[PDB]
Amino acid sequence: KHDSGAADLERVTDYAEEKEIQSSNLETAMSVIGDRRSREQKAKQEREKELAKVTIKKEDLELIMTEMEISRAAAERSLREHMGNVVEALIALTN
Amino acid sequence: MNIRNARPEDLMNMQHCNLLCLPENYQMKYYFYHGLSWPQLSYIAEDENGKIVGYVLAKMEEDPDDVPHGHITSLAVKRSHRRLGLAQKLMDQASRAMIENFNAKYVSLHVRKSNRAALHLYSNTLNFQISEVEPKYYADGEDAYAMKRDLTQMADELRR
Amino acid sequence: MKGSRIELGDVTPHNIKQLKRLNQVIFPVSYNDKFYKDVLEVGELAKLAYFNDIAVGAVCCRVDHSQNQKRLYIMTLGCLAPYRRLGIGTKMLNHVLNICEKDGTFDNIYLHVQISNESAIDFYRKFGFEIIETKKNYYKRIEPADAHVLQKNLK
Amino acid sequence: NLQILRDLSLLQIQMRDLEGYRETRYQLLQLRPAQRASWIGYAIAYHLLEDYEMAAKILEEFRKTQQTSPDKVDYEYSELLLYQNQVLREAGLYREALEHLCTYEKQICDKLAVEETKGELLLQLCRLEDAADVYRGLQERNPENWAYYKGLEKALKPANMLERLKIYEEAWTKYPRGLVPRRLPLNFLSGEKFKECLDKFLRMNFSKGCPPVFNTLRSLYKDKEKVAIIEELVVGYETSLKSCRLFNPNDDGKEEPPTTLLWVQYYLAQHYDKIGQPSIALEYINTAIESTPTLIELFLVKAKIYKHAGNIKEAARWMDEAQALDTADRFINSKCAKYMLKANLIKEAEEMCSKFTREGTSAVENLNEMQCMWFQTECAQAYKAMNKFGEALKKCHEIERHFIEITDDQFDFHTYCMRKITLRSYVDLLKLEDVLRQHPFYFKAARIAIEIYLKLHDNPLPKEELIPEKLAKVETPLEEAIKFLTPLKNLVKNKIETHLFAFEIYFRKEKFLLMLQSVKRAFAIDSSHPWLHECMIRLFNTAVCESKDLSDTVRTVLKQEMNRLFGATNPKNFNETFLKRNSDSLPHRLSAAKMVYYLDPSSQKRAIELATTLDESLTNRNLQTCMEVLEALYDGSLGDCKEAAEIYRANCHKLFPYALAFMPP
Ligand SMILES: CC(=O)SCCNC(=O)CCNC(=O)[C@H](O)C(C)(C)COP(=O)(O)OP(=O)(O)OC[C@H]1O[C@@H](n2cnc3c(N)ncnc32)[C@H](O)[C@@H]1OP(=O)(O)O
Ligand SMILES: O=P(O)(O)O[C@H]1[C@H](OP(=O)(O)O)[C@H](OP(=O)(O)O)[C@H](OP(=O)(O)O)[C@@H](OP(=O)(O)O)[C@H]1OP(=O)(O)O
């Protein structure tokens, strides 16, 4: 009688009702957790809001898109992050 | 040699030892299940170059009808690196890991009758006792012993 | 008992060709495969002997029914040259003696042997195998074309 | 509805958009603040977002909530405190983690990881003798580890080698049964004490009869004089043992079993196999065969002495009998299948591997069901060696297919792993499934895969299932080949052959900045590698010959990066400098002899003049390089040279008699 683990993974996918935890004043913690979270959300928003006002040229972008073959989003990030110049952006993608 | 804990990113090559050493083969999802559920009791023996040379993949059998106990599923080492005292070190490291994490009352395994060296090593040196002879266990058609070992004296030696 | 590395072993279905390779070389005559089919189903009556966990010796035996008796004939002894008096003969020949005594319901044991190996018949007479028969021209292609028959009784 | 947002959380942890999963899990938090799975998700998220010092106090105030429940079981919060000590260990807060496990050491059930946490924090915070007591407790805990002994060495800080070996001598005294305390002094020690240590080591391991001791000693065969003194010691043992039946006539002990003679003959025969003189190895293994014909490992190294030599078929015919002695274990017929596949036999290896498998189907499909990567990749390399490509390309595609399956498998257990409480193995297997494709079997298959794709492109003639003759004849192999190559490029970069096959796969696509960045990422590791050097040679060869058929944007950056890394030289003097700085290395000499014909075909008389040197002062002169130089001579990359190759193989056969590729036809 050898099962080879057929019923070993069946009760992994079973249905059960999880336990209940008594509420005891978690708000004082989650206030400063939400304040820290809003701080890093403000920083991560400020990144794209300061780099959002960058002009985009089409021919150099399509030349880079032909010559190194990634998606348009990461190439747009790399071209907006290098002050609109093609040469040292190509050096940094080559580095 | 080296006996160390079951890091999961290692274990996906020790199945390569399984398919190279003992004929009873298992699914890999079994390995990813028993690499996360109880990571402490299974151990890996290596050499210097990072090549896998032996393993114990074990299991604590969950049975609420009686006391909780363990279940050794796989012990293997290569024949090119055998007769150095590997398998007994891996086995009693796994046994002391079980008795230090969740109090193994007894350990149990199943071993075929045709092999002699493994039968000898489980029989007299590491001191298993034959509890039941189960007929027609493996695929090739050999009857297997269902061996057990009592670990209460090991429990009271490690509890001191 | 202690310090020595001698253990006996059963002939299983997976260990046939090593028995082949030992008894092709221990004795100069060779017989066909039905010999090796006969040495299989007897169970614990035909076994081999490992010194330092490598195969050195072997004894296989048969059951005979002739000359108004119920007889046992050890088919072959197997051992090598550089291992003489170092772990083959005495202990597992006493093993075939004590399985013959733990059954104990039979009559005698006997053996055929060459005439040229006087050390062999000395080693057999150390346990009590007395000489009663000298058969002429028993071997078929070797130089000692004659043979001796040794025998002990049980009852 | 809650199941839709749980499904969204699982599909967003599937596709690895992290903060979207975070936003929809904070939707669970303002939906409900009491589930554990939110805190598990927070722990795994800011472990993989690498913010730790605030997660310290956050996991403290999660530990605060669960201590007051009366129906609670202990193992979950024990490993929760262990995961807390892990995240405070990687936080950099070292004293904070130290005082935390000193305060919550008694709320555990696992002594083990608490103990390694204390040991690592006592290694880190400069405290010496307490950490020495911790690692003595580990040596009494486990007598066998590299990391524990190395931590005790770098904690006690030995002044000289003698006080360093005092640790292993006292470890010999209280723990005589261990193995690596008898081994670790043989790594660094040199001299007469090293000789007298290895003397009693191999004396014990030959009296007891340990086979793989040579394997331990082939960790230390990189030195020259150690090999010579071991070989002189062993031949002194046998020249004393076949005269007066003991190791040496100075001492008087119990007389050894006569298996010791053939056992030391086995050891020295494999030693003569390693040092590369097979004639004495045969002259001693013949006496080893005539002593006893029945043990398996003697005929296994009888196969290995021919496998390390050239002729592979004699190893196969001896080793088939060697495994035909007994048919008990899968090891010896697995190596029989490997040796038959390297002996250019496919049907015998198939019927040999089909014995221990299940008898309900064929052998190759049965080992495909149980994911046997070894047999498939090795017979794919053997099928490449049979000079045709179809089912090897097929097997490469299905091994990458079950790689896709083993990278997709993880969806099933996350409900149980949010129902269970184990986190550090969970973050480690999420971390492995980020980087799962770095295993060396995948690279071992992918190198011959990319090699046969480029060889097929250079010289042309209910999911998807594969038949070889349609799937090997795709009209352009390069785009699917770079699709199979790009996880190997993105995930592992510390090995130069990944970027070198990236070079070889971009050479026929002509994307010059990808070309040059693969050049840079390969050059930043090794600069004196020969095959990379002729990659450089072809790079600036096509640069100086094709400096006009490219746009003006690529001109300036290519010229300034070439000014950065290269300068302004010609191929001829650069290959001259390269052949002079490697004027003793035979693969480098072949590597220069290739381009001394490639850059100009008229200098072919120099090329045979350059790659025919045979003196004993050459570095790395084995049968691999000699088979490589005859193979490269007959590949046509250097020239058609049937007037000197016969006398060169006749001269090489006198120095290597036991190779099949140097036999006279
Ligand atoms: C699921 C199961 O566990 S059962 C079904 C599958 N079972 C297995 O795979 C396990 C057995 N299979 C194997 O391939 C084995 O590992 C083997 C054949 C390589 C043997 O492994 P080894 O490395 O030799 O074990 P180990 O390192 O402990 O050997 C040393 C000790 O083993 C003991 N031993 C038992 N039998 C022998 C024997 N024939 N010869 C020598 N030593 C033996 C001795 O006590 C020896 O100590 P010693 O040096 O003082 O003599
Ligand atoms: O450990 P792996 O990477 O899986 O491969 C090794 C390695 O083979 P490769 O280096 O060619 O891949 C050994 O080759 P050597 O370096 O020892 O020459 C070989 O041993 P042999 O070829 O000499 O027989 C055998 O190692 P071992 O016998 O210790 O297991 C083998 O292991 P695998 O069978 O798992 O591939």
Residue numbers in the entry:
A (entry chain D): 35 to 129
B (entry chain C): 1 to 160
C (entry chain A): 1 to 155
D (entry chain B): 113 to 573, 638 to 841
According to the publication:
NatA forms complexes with at least two other proteins, NAA50 and the chaperone protein Huntingtin-interacting protein K (HYPK). The trimeric hNAA10/hNAA15/hNAA50 complex is referred to as hNatE, and we refer to the tetrameric hNAA10/hNAA15/hNAA50/HYPK complex as hNatE/HYPK. NatA acetylates non-methionine containing substrates harboring small N-terminal residues (alanine, serine, threonine, cysteine, and valine). Taken together, these studies reveal the molecular basis for coordinated N-terminal acetylation by the hNAA10 and hNAA50 catalytic subunits of NatE and its modulation by HYPK.
To obtain a molecular understanding of how hNAA50 and HYPK can both bind hNatA, we determined the structure of the hNatE/HYPK complex by cryo-EM, which we were able to resolve to an overall resolution of 4.0 Å. While both hNAA50 and HYPK contact both subunits of hNatA, no direct interactions are observed between hNAA50 and HYPK. HYPK binds NatA mainly through interactions with the hNAA15 subunit of hNatA: only the α1 helix of HYPK interacts with hNAA10, while the α2 and C-terminal UBA domain (α3, α4, and α5 helices) of HYPK interact with hNAA15. However, HYPK-Glu103, hNAA15-Lys685, and hNAA15-Glu655 which form a salt bridge in the hNatA/HYPK structure do not show a similar contact in the tetrameric hNatE/HYPK complex. We speculate that the absence of this interaction might contribute to the slightly weaker affinity of HYPK for hNatE over hNatA. Interestingly, however, a key residue that stabilizes the hNatA-hNAA50 interaction, hNAA15-Thr406 shifts from in interaction with the carbonyl of hNAA50-Ala55 to a hydrogen bond to the hNAA50-Gln18 side chain in the tetrameric complex. In addition, while hNAA50-Asp53 and hNAA10-Arg83 maintain interaction as observed in the hNatA/hNAA50 complex, hNAA50-Glu7 and hNAA10-Arg116 lose interaction in the tetrameric complex. The overall overlay suggests that both the hNAA10 and hNAA15 subunits of hNatA shift in the direction that is away from the hNAA50 binding region to make closer and more optimal contacts with HYPK. To understand the molecular basis for this, we overlayed structures of hNatE and hNatE/HYPK with the common hNatA subunits aligned. This superposition reveals that the largest structural differences within the hNAA50 subunit map to the β6–β7 and α1–α2 loops, which shift such that the hNAA50 peptide substrate-binding groove is ~2.4 Å wider in the hNatE/HYPK complex relative to the hNatE complex. In addition, the hNAA50 β3–β4 loop is shifted in the direction away from hNatA by ~3.5 Å in the presence of HYPK.
